[PDB]
C-alpha cells in the first residue's frame, strides 16, 4: 500500500485544495495535492484501532465489599455487608464509560472476571479460606434477604462459587432487550409528567449478588470484590463528540455546576507558539 505517491510541480485550473466546508463534507485532501512528494508505503494496517480491539480489554467496572462475621443479632444482613448486590452498569467508573460513549448504540457479549481479596484489619490468628458465591439475579427473581436465604439455592439462576484470592470468569451473551444497548436515550418510560428522563431499561444488563459461603470464625474478615468487564464481538453505531466535562451520575449526561474551563488558555497571544 502506498502512503504517498510521487507527485511533481502543478500549474493547473484544477485546484483540489479550495473547497466549501459549508457542505458538511471533509474532502479527502493529501500531501501530494499541495507539495511535491516521493513514494512511501504504509507498512501498517490499523489493526489496533478496530472497535473490537478498542473495547476488547478488561476494565474495572465495580468494586464492592462484603464481610464474614457472626450474623447473630444482625437485623439487616444487607446493611451489615453480610452480603451485597450490584445492578450491572458500565457507567459508574469513568474510564470505560468515556470509551463506550464515543458511540450511541453498542452491541457485544461480555466476559466478566471477578477478583476477590481478603483483608483482616484487626488482630486475627490467621487468614481463613473463604469461598465467595456470585449469583446473577435477573429482574423478577426473588432477591436475597439474609446471607443464607432460600434464594441462594439458585436453582434456576446462574451462580459461580470461587475462593477469595482467586478469580472467577464466565461470559454472558448480549442480554439487551433491543438490537443494541442505548448509550444514550432522549426519552422516558412513558408519557408521565414526573417520570425519570434518560435512564432506561434499554441498557439493563442484569444484576449480581455476592456473599461468603463460610460461617464465621472468631475474627472478622473483609472481602473486597472487583468486577472487570471485557466486550467481545463488538458492534458500534453512530459516533458522537467525546465527553468533555466530568460525570455526576450513572445514566444522565449531567455535568457539575461551576465546573472549570476545559479548554487550556494560552500563556500568551493567539500569535504565540
Amino acid at each position: 500500500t502506498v502512503a504517498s505517491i510521487s507527485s511533481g510541480p502543478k500549474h493547473t485550473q484544477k485546484v483540489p485544495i479550495l473547497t466549501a466546508n459549508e457542505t458538511g463534507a471533509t474532502m479527502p485532501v493529501l500531501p501530494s495535492d499541495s507539495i511535491e512528494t516521493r513514494t512511501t508505503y504504509m507498512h501498517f494496517n490499523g489493526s489496533e484501532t478496530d472497535v473490537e480491539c478498542f473495547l476488547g480489554r478488561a476494565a474495572c467496572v465495580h468494586v464492592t465489599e462484603i464481610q464474614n462475621k457472626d450474623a447473630t443479632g444482625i437485623d439487616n444482613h444487607r446493611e451489615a455487608k453480610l452480603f451485597n448486590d450490584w445492578k450491572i452498569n458500565l457507567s459508574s467508573l469513568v474510564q470505560l464509560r468515556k470509551k463506550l460513549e464515543l458511540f450511541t448504540y453498542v452491541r457485544f457479549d461480555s466476559e466478566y472476571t471477578i477478583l476477590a481479596t481478603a483483608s483482616q484489619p484487626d488482630s486475627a490468628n490467621y487468614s481463613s479460606n473463604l469461598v465467595v458465591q456470585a449469583m446473577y439475579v435477573p429482574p423478577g427473581a426473588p432477591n436475597p434477604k439474609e446471607w443464607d436465604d432460600y434464594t441462594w439455592q439458585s436453582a434456576s439462576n446462574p451462580s459461580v462459587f470461587f475462593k477469595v484470592g482467586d478469580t472467577s470468569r464466565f461470559s454472558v451473551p448480549y442480554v439487551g432487550l433491543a438490537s443494541a444497548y442505548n448509550c444514550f436515550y432522549d426519552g422516558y418510560s412513558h408519557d408521565d409528567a414526573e417520570t425519570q428522563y434518560g435512564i432506561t431499561v434499554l441498557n439493563h444488563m442484569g444484576s449480581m449478588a455476592f456473599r461468603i459461603v463460610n460461617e464465621h470464625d472468631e475474627h472478622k474478615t473483609l472481602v473486597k470484590i472487583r468486577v472487570y468487564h471485557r466486550a467481545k464481538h463488538v458492534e458500534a453505531w453512530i459516533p458522537r463528540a467525546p465527553r468533555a466535562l466530568p460525570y455526576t451520575s450513572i445514566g444522565r449526561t449531567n455535568y457539575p455546576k461551576n465546573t472549570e474551563p476545559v479548554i487550556k488558555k494560552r500563556k500568551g497571544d493567539i500569535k504565540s507558539y
Partner: protein, 255 residues
C-alpha cells in the same frame, strides 16, 4: 447549467426552491426507507398516509440577533401539531419516520455570520442542577417552539450552555454529526435528509424523540452599517416515509 446551488424539493403537495444551496447532507449516507419485514417485530399491518403526512411543515420563525445563543428542536416533537402528521402521532401506539430538514436564512453581500445546522441522534440533555436531577418531560417536549438556548435556566428543564451541547461535550466536536453550515457569504439554506435511526424497528412517538435539530450562530451576525441588527431564521421540515402502527384511543401526554 445545474449548480450545486439551485435546488427544488417537491414532497407531497409542497415544494421548496433554493437558489443558493451548498449541496445537501444525507445522514450517514442513507436515505429514508420503510421498515422491511426481515426487521419487523410487531405483527400489525402499518398505515402509510403518504402524501398527507409527507409534505413540508414550516415552523414559526426565529430571530437571529447579535446576542443569540442558538435554538434546539426535537423530532418528532416539533411536528406534534402539524396537520394529519400530528393526529396520526397521538392516535397510534407506534410510528416511524425520516425527514427532510430545510433551514433558511438570507441576508445580503454586506452581512457576515455563520450558523451550524446539525442533527444529533439520541440527544439526551443534561439537567443544569448537576448530580442526578432529571429533566422533566415538558422541558424536552417544547413542540414547535423548540428550546431557546439563550432563555434562562428553569426548574426541571435542561442546561442551555452552548459550549457544551446541552450534554457535557464541546461545541467544536458537533461536526462529527451530519451537519451543514449557513455562511451568509456562501449559503442561504441548509438541507439534511434524516433516515430513521433507532435500536428498535419502530417506537413510541411521544415518549422518545430520536433526533434534535440544532441551529447555532458560531460567527456572530454582523450587519452592514445602520442596517437593522437582526435576520429571521425559518425551519421547514417534512416527514418522509412515515408509517404508523397500533391504532387505538389517542394518547394523553403531560401538560
Amino acid at each position: 447549467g445545474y449548480s450545486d446551488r439551485v435546488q427544488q424539493i417537491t414532497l407531497g403537495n409542497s415544494t421548496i426552491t433554493t437558489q443558493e444551496a451548498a449541496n445537501a447532507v444525507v445522514c450517514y449516507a442513507e436515505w429514508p426507507e420503510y421498515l422491511p419485514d426481515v426487521d419487523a417485530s410487531d405483527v400489525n399491518k402499518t398505515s402509510k398516509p403518504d402524501t398527507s403526512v409527507c409534505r413540508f411543515y414550516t415552523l414559526d420563525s426565529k430571530t437571529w440577533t447579535t446576542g443569540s445563543k442558538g435554538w434546539c428542536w426535537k423530532l418528532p416533537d416539533a411536528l406534534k401539531d402539524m396537520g394529519v402528521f400530528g393526529q396520526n402521532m397521538f392516535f397510534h401506539s407506534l410510528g416511524r419516520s425520516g425527514y427532510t430538514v430545510h433551514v433558511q436564512c438570507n441576508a445580503t453581500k454586506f452581512h457576515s455570520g455563520c450558523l451550524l445546522v446539525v442533527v444529533i441522534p439520541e440527544h439526551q440533555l443534561a439537567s443544569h442542577e448537576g448530580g442526578n436531577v432529571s429533566v422533566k418531560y415538558t422541558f424536552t417536549h417544547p413542540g414547535e417552539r423548540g428550546i431557546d438556548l439563550s432563555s434562562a435556566n428553569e426548574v426541571g428543564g435542561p442546561v442551555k450552555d452552548v459550549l457544551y451541547n446541552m450534554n457535557g461535550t464541546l461545541l467544536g466536536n458537533l461536526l462529527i454529526f451530519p451537519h451543514q453550515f449557513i455562511n451568509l457569504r456562501t449559503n442561504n439554506t441548509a438541507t439534511i435528509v434524516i433516515p430513521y435511526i433507532n435500536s428498535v424497528p419502530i417506537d413510541s412517538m411521544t415518549r422518545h424523540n430520536n433526533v434534535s435539530l440544532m441551529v447555532i450562530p458560531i460567527a456572530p451576525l454582523t450587519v452592514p452599517t445602520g442596517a437593522t441588527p437582526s435576520l429571521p431564521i425559518t425551519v421547514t421540515i417534512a416527514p418522509m416515509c412515515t408509517e404508523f402502527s397500533g391504532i387505538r384511543s389517542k394518547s394523553i401526554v403531560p401538560q
